Design a protein around this ligand. Structure first.
Ligand SMILES: Nc1ncnc2c1ncn2[C@@H]1O[C@H](COP(=O)(O)OP(=O)(O)O)[C@@H](O)[C@H]1O
Ligand SMILES: [Mg+2]
Lengths: 70, 77, 371, 70, 188
């Protein structure tokens, strides 16, 4: 018939809109996940650097007594 | 120099809703209504009328047979 | 009062009042004179049947289009068509209604100059405005960005627009259009035995093209498939019977759009000229044009073009970008819808070319700031 | 008929597939964004204590140089 | 650009074979205006600039103000949408980038070359534009030898005849030892 064509076009329109929304959401979710992983990476590197600095402060403190005895 | 369009205010891509969503439902419903009314008006009435004309045709056939037979009976000489 | 959005175009004149959604009158733009003599007298014989009348009595007429490729080559016939449209199809006096004519881009200046002269001298319209057929097509979609390929019946032009700022150096224009596709179909129909020569039979060939032809998603594979089996053989009936069968000519006719090497044209197809025009634009706006490619015009209404064009562009385009083809179902009347939208805006009411300006500055006012 | 009906059913099924996929993607995007915010705030405080640690190491090395050079 | 603006009059050239015809038309008819605004105003009113040309099958064409509008692009690249300035300002910018002591000599010794600088009427437009840009007191001279087209090849022929140039060549042995990247070295 004819109204079948109109209904079919309306449903194809809805499918187009839904698939577009899904694609956009998936892309943004991917991007946010990459940002989060970069943040975690820099946090762990920050812990490494802070640990090294604390180690060298401790060694310097160990050298303090040798200083005061000298 | 190329023409310079005076600056206005708005809008665009906001009439797509008001020209699309309207016919997205009204047109479908109206065409469904048209198909329903046309089928109802057309098909059943046509079949009933054809049956009526067929009955009249059969009666005409009977009348033709009777007249043909009586005339052949008389005229046979 | 309201203005008349008249889009003469090339192939089908579409007219209607501003503020509507569909044109009031759509009729072929042909002027057909009789070629025989005629013996019966008192039959109310006219001397030139124009408009839709020439499509019903085409047997005794020599149909002759007045527009070859965008430009107008038969001024008297086009004037007759305008007269018939104004006085006989809408029955409104043009003396009290502004008009919005449409023109293909990159046309010679004489066309718009003479159009304005005729509109102001003969019909005596209050004010007329000339618009390019691609900006109107972008107007109709409700968007404001994108690259529109408005493949009419006389010319195929591709215009990119970004944020409302037209790019005049990235417009691609080709003279391959619906009329050439009809001619090529009429030429390839001679391989099966069917011979059409008369100008009236071109309308039959065009009806065949509209009702039967389609664009294959892949040309070589489909042609190899159809050359062995018989699944594509479709039958069609001429206005006197004589049922004909179409096989692999079904998709060879509209493949000329993407591969113009068939009819001897040097230029590339519509799948590659769009990408080439994209590469002409700036590098910072190519993503939006990729995501907002718009189809319009009648000749892009074949079933299966929104997939072939997308596949070809995606093959050409870089892998990362997402290619989207916006093809509304009412592409054929997109230009007039855009014109009706344009005419109903309050900001546009100051851009009409008033008669006083034409009288003071001559016919060249169209080329100046008043676009 | 049969073909048009089933095609419509398939179209709606595909559309709803896209919808549910989009919903899951959006929820995950929000989760990733909250995770990133918390990582950012942890990183800021760790940077602050890093600056304090480096400053104290600086004063410690200054003291070590003071004493060992006396 | 000339092939694009010729469509404004009625003649359409598309196929690559006709680009040679348009190139020949450009070489034969185009000329660079001394001043653009007044010339454009005159060409749109009078009829003394419209010149005719014969296509290779007959069908003579008549070009009007397109004569001096195509070469105008060199001094105003906004026609094709390019961002940079014209050749009359690029030269001055390249001069001003140089040190302050050698600007006078470059002002007085500007040299032109290349085929596209063979347009009749470019040496005076360039002089006027540079005078407009550069400081007024300095003397500006534009060298335009009659043999501009072959200037590069004449220079190459002169260079190849010098005696001191005989050791600058890239010996095949050096290429065999160092590969094609030998050209980037001090051996240019
Ligand atoms: N449904 C269709 N399928 C295929 N081709 C069509 C269809 N409708 C129109 N065409 C082609 O498009 C042409 C009409 O194009 P149109 O958009 O009216 O041109 P214009 O830009 O001059 O108005 C016709 O000549 C016909 O060849
Ligand atoms: Mg059109």
């Amino acid at each position: 018939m004819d109204a079948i064509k109109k209904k079919m076009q309306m449903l194809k329109l809805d499918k187009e809109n839904a698939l577009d929304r899904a694609e956009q959401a998936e892309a943004d979710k991917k991007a946010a996940e990459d940002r989060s992983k970069q943040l975690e990476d820099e946090l762990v590197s920050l812990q490494k650097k802070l640990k090294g600095t604390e180690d060298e402060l401790d060694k310097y403190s160990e050298a303090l007594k040798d200083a005061q005895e000298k | 120099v190329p023409p310079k369009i005076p600056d206005g205010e708005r809008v665009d891509f906001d009439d797509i809703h008001r020209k699309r969503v309207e016919k997205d439902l009204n047109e479908l419903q109206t065409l469904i209504e048209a198909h329903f009314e046309n089928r109802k008006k057309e098909e059943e009435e046509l079949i009933s009328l054809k049956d009526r004309i067929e009955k009249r045709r059969a009666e005409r056939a009977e009348q033709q047979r009777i007249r043909n037979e009586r005339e052949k009976e008389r005229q046979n000489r | 009062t309201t203005a008349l959005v008249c889009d003469n175009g090339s192939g089908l004149v579409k007219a209607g009042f501003a503020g509507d959604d569909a044109p009031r009158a759509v009729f072929p733009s042909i002027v057909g004179r009789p070629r025989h003599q005629g013996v019966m007298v008192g039959m109310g014989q006219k001397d030139s049947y124009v408009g839709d009348e020439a499509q019903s009595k085409r047997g005794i007429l020599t149909l002759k289009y007045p527009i070859e490729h965008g430009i107008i080559t038969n001024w008297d016939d086009m004037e007759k068509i305008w007269h018939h449209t104004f006085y006989n199809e809408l029955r409104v006096a043009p003396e009290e209604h502004p008009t919005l004519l449409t023109e293909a881009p990159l046309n010679p200046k004489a066309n718009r100059e003479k159009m304005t002269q005729i509109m102001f001298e003969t019909f005596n319209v209050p004010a007329m405005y000339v618009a390019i057929q691609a900006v109107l097509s972008l107007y109709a979609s409700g968007r404001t960005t994108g690259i529109v390929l408005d493949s009419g019946d006389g010319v195929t032009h591709n215009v990119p627009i970004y944020e409302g700022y037209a790019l005049p150096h990235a417009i691609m224009r080709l003279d391959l259009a619906g009329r050439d596709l009809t001619d090529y179909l009429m030429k390839i129909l001679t391989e099966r035995g069917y011979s059409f020569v008369t100008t009236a039979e071109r309308e039959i060939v065009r009806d065949i093209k509209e009702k039967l032809c389609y664009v294959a998603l892949d040309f070589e594979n489909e042609m190899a498939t159809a050359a062995s089996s018989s699944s594509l053989e479709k039958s069609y009936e001429l206005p006197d019977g004589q049922v004909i069968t179409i096989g692999n000519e079904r998709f060879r006719c509209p493949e000329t759009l993407f591969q113009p090497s068939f009819i001897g044209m040097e230029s590339a197809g519509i799948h590659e000229t769009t990408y080439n025009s994209i590469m002409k634009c700036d590098i910072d706006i190519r993503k939006d044009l990729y995501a907002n490619n718009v189809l319009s015009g009648g000749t892009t209404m074949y079933p299966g073009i929104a997939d072939r064009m997308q596949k070809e562009i995606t093959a050409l385009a870089p892998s990362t970008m997402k290619i989207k083809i916006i093809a509304p179902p009412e592409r054929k009347y997109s230009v007039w819808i855009g014109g009706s939208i344009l005419a109903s805006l309050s900001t546009f009411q100051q851009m009409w070319i008033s008669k006083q300006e034409y009288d003071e500055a001559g016919p060249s006012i169209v080329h100046r700031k008043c676009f």
